[PDB]
Design a protein around this ligand. Structure first.
Ligand SMILES: Nc1ncnc2c1ncn2[C@@H]1O[C@H](COP(=O)(O)OP(=O)(O)OP(O)(O)=S)[C@@H](O)[C@H]1O
Ligand SMILES: Nc1ncnc2c1ncn2[C@@H]1O[C@H](COP(=O)(O)OP(=O)(O)OP(O)(O)=S)[C@@H](O)[C@H]1O
Ligand SMILES: Nc1ncnc2c1ncn2[C@@H]1O[C@H](COP(=O)(O)OP(=O)(O)O)[C@@H](O)[C@H]1O
Lengths: 610, 26, 119, 118, 121
């Protein structure tokens, strides 16, 4: 009766139907039964990487024992699970723990051959004394039976350190299942999730949840890396079955917020955005009613909705409103970069490719180098495409490869080999892509790097992964890699495509997509630039409202002088701060150009006065 | 009558460092 | 002087908790002053960080006032290493004076060196 | 085989080659070989479209037009993989999110001087 | 003489007998030595230059185990700036390395092979 206070009982909990079907893994159940009935040295250990299902093997063994498909020498063994945490509780005297353990071993020994102890996480059995060593004569007589499961590394951290204990055990290596066997499992666990949450589940949902968790979520092994998607889609549908959906709630809370703010200010402005939002919320509401007048189960879109809401990556199915964006993207990106039609037509062809799901799975969604002369826009394009995807300029990861001039700088983006000074810090590129893997990665001035960094950007391409000084293959599988350059500027296409093959190797140019050589500028397509600068200046002094009434001959005059065929559009942005900014900054801190007032500009025969 | 009163400990483990030894390339 | 004899596995922890409850149990009076606070991070090594982050939930509401003074190059070695705490503190930079203010400082300390040395 | 094995012997340790098994040297590529690679890439691009149950009907003049283009004999087989998706996947991807490519209804490919219409 | 005879099978046959070691031969190939910047690979670089940790191509395999037979494959294509280095090998029992230490050749065997001939008697 000593086991009644300290242990538990799986078998009484197995007869009452508290467990899930464990259909799968017949080989390992047969292996455990093959070991457990041996004469001596008959105590197996289930060893596997964490996630693969090791307690469920023992639950399936218990269900098979209660069912009665076991061999002859397993007639009602009544598996009893122990607790090593309950043993050390109040045992604060000189001998209380060892006499408790001796009472437990006596109540195991006086039985004939029945009780099969199940000790989960038996790295705890190593210490627990300050003792804990009076198990070796009980183990090395074939008297204790002791099924117990650990993980992989916790085995070698404790038990391989203890090479005398290690002999009196077996090892049953449990490995990960496949994707098809995951699908075969997920048709069995469906009834419990339909009982606990009152929903319905299509088989298409269970095959899409097993296909779609292979690509995106890559940290956990897959009997249970795909259970959570179903288990959270059911909860989201249970949210939407109760009182109200989601959007209408979103909009109601938002308009209540803007209402609050506005009435507190009593800004206009918001007054408009209120009204607009009230129009929308009205429309939707009516639509809601209409629908009612006219979802109730999970589908293969809801799983992708969960894997899009988690881990950042938008991976739904041809979403609404974005077709008004991606088919407008080739023209919306032109409002910030003027000219270069071929480069934008090639960049859009990598976002509209992978949004529709045509691109290759184990490959980055775009990784391509573009170059030319200076002042053209090759940095402005990368900062201009990542503005509408991300709503901020700082979601870019912009590392500069001008500083990596020598050999050993490569270790700053991979970490340290384990055993050296900076190991707590880890990497400096890799530890920022493992968090939310959807960024845009830049590489500025790839001319300047030592030719050993190209041995790191070589398995990034065509595979997508890299290890580091921590032992974790991060995935670059759906980021966008942008390389810049400045080679040559001395021909149309022949000299720069000779210099690229002169500097780079053939095995690196092979791994790229379309290399995009730019063209420069033209004076007709320069004037269209200039107003942006003026409009940008019209934003910069917006906090004092000194908006500029610029005459059109001034915009004409800024285009004649300032055109250089070799320095791009960069002399113009210094010419503006020489013409306007000097005289305005002199007139602004002396009085007389007080805020809330407007100033025009007129073309003097050499300058332009205020 | 006598209690045990388990105690704490402090473990130290330092770290090596390497020098890079540039080569004048001639 | 608070880690004097604490070789048992729970003495320093309850000692610091008793000090914090003695400060909290006085209704907003005591200004604490911990000099050279860059050695407060790894105060109690429990083999597992469980000391030096006991005041970490208490500073966020601001119940103890905690004047400190650390060196500039001792600050990016211990606190910036362990940057969860670095937001809890405002920084007050102190630069050295020039010659003309040192002339004014030295004429006020010519009252304590005439007593210790009767000259 | 002379210069490349001379460079291999100049790069390793002298008995490190004898402990190895047969050090193999690969071929180049051939225009006869290149048709079945296009077959493999079309089969892969078909099996990628099996979730949304689209499929393709590729004509033999188009299937050999993919073999005439992309024969730069220094870059291996990797330009053809890019050339297929520059031809097929871009046009299909533009059409697919613009309606009109509703699922189940397959599309054939047809030859048009340098593109291929769908 | 010819190739594929025993011309290096004799060489392995006297290392294992007279020096009692199976792997105590050094087979270097002078099939790259046509220039002035190629001879210095078989002696080393000064302390500060390109190939220094690897040492000499010849001497750092003779400093340890100085009980070796030494071959020299294909001498006939070598530039005429090896034979002054190779001459004092067979004229004195000393040679200087890239570091500055001394190697002693007084208990080795030199074998200079080629393949021209084999049609003339
Ligand atoms: N063959 C199977 N049939 C049904 N469910 C399974 C099967 N294999 C694994 N599972 C489920 O997968 C999950 C694995 O949970 P556990 O096995 O308890 O985790 P674990 O393997 O014990 O990992 P740790 O390190 O011990 S927490 C559970 O939800 C099991 O029900
Ligand atoms: N075609 C263009 N469209 C819009 N703005 C442009 C264009 N060309 C230049 N600019 C502007 O001029 C500046 C361009 O600077 P960058 O493009 O960053 O220089 P760059 O392209 O990186 O060339 P280098 O060789 O790297 S200095 C920015 O202020 C842009 O706004
Ligand atoms: N007398 C011999 N004894 C053993 N092997 C021989 C003999 N003659 C030729 N061979 C064969 O030729 C090979 C040795 O060729 P080798 O002397 O290395 O040619 P090379 O002249 O190019 O150095 C051996 O693998 C061996 O099988």
């Amino acid at each position: 009766q000593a086991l009644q206070k300290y242990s538990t009982d799986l078998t009484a909990r197995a007869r009452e139907g508290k467990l899930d079907p464990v259909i799968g893994r017949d080989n390992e159940i047969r292996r455990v039964v093959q070991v457990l009935s041996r004469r001596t040295k008959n105590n197996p250990v289930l060893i596997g990487e964490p996630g693969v299902g090791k307690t469920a093997i023992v639950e399936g063994l218990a269900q098979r024992i209660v069912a009665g498909d076991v061999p002859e020498s397993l007639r009602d063994k009544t598996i009893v699970a122990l607790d090593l945490g309950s043993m050390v509780a109040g045992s604060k005297y000189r001998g209380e723990f060892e006499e408790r353990l001796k009472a437990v071993l006596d109540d195991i020994k006086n039985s004939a051959g029945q009780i099969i102890t199940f000790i989960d996480e038996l790295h705890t059995i190593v210490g627990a004394g300050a003792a804990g060593n009076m198990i070796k004569p009980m183990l090395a007589r074939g008297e204790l039976r002791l099924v117990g499961a650990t993980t992989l590394d916790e085995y070698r951290k404790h038990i391989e350190k203890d090479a005398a204990l290690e002999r009196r055990f077996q090892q049953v290596y449990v490995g990960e299942p496949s994707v098809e066997d995951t699908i075969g499992i997920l048709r069995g666990l469906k009834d419990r999730y339909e009982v606990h949450h009152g929903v319905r589940i299509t088989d298409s949902a269970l095959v899409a949840a097993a296909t779609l968790s292979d690509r995106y979520i890559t940290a956990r092994f897959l009997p249970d890396k795909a259970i959570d998607l179903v288990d959270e889609a059911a909860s989201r549908l249970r949210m939407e079955i109760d009182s109200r959906p989601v959007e209408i709630d979103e909009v109601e809370r938002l308009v209540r917020r803007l209402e609050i703010e506005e009435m507190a200010l009593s800004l206009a402005k918001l007054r408009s955005e209120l009204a607009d939002q009230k129009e929308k919320l009205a429309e939707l509401t009516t639509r809601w009613q209409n629908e009612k007048n006219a979802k109730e189960e999970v589908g293969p879109d809801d799983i992708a909705d969960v894997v899009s809401a988690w881990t950042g990556i938008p991976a739904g199915r041809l979403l609404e409103g974005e077709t008004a964006k991606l088919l407008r993207m080739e023209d919306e990106l032109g409002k910030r970069v003027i000219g270069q039609k071929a480069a934008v037509t090639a960049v859009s062809d990598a976002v509209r490719r992978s949004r529709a799901g045509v691109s290759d799975p184990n490959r980055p969604t775009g990784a391509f180098m573009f170059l030319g002369p200076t002042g053209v826009g090759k940095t402005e394009l990368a900062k201009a495409l990542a503005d509408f995807l991300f709503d901020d300029e700082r979601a870019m990861v912009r590392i500069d490869m001008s500083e990596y001039g020598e050999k050993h700088t490569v270790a700053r983006l991979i970490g340290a080999p384990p055993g050296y000074v900076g190991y707590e810090a880890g990497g400096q590129l890799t530890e920022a892509v493992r968090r939310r893997p959807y960024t845009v990665v830049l590489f500025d001035e790839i001319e300047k790097a030592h030719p050993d960094v190209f041995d790191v950007l070589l398995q990034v391409l065509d595979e997508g992964r890299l290890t580091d000084g921590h032992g974790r293959t991060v995935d670059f599988r759906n980021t966008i890699l942008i390389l810049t350059s400045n080679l040559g500027s001395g021909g149309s296409a022949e000299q720069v495509l000779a210099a690229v093959r002169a500097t780079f190797k053939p095995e690196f140019i092979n791994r790229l997509d379309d290399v995009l050589i730019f063209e420069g500028l033209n004076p007709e397509e320069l004037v269209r630039i200039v107003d942006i600068q003026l409009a940008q200046l019209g934003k910069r002094l917006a906090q004092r409202r000194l908006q500029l009434q610029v005459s059109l001959p001034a915009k004409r005059w800024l285009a004649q002088r300032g055109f250089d065929p070799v320095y791009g559009a960069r002399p113009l942005r210094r010419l503006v701060q020489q013409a306007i900014g000097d005289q305005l900054a002199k007139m602004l801190l002396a009085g007389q150009v007080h805020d809330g007032d407007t100033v025009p500009v007129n073309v003097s025969p050499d300058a332009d006065s205020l | 009558a006598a209690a045990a009163a388990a105690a704490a400990a402090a473990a130290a483990a330092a770290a090596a460092a390497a020098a890079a030894a540039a080569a004048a390339a001639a | 002087s608070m880690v004097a004899g604490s070789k048992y596995r729970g003495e320093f922890e309850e000692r610091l908790k008793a000090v914090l409850d003695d400060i909290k149990n006085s209704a907003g009076q005591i200004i604490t002053f911990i000099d050279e606070l860059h050695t407060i991070v790894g105060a109690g090594a429990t083999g597992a960080m469980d000391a030096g982050n006991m005041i970490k939930p208490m500073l966020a509401r601001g119940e103890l006032r905690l004047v400190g003074a650390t060196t500039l190059d001792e600050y990016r070695k211990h606190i910036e290493k362990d940057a969860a705490l670095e937001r809890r503190f405002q920084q007050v930079y102190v630069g050295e004076p020039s010659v003309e203010d040192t002339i004014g400082i030295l004429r006020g300390l010519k009252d304590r060196y005439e007593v210790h040395h009767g000259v």
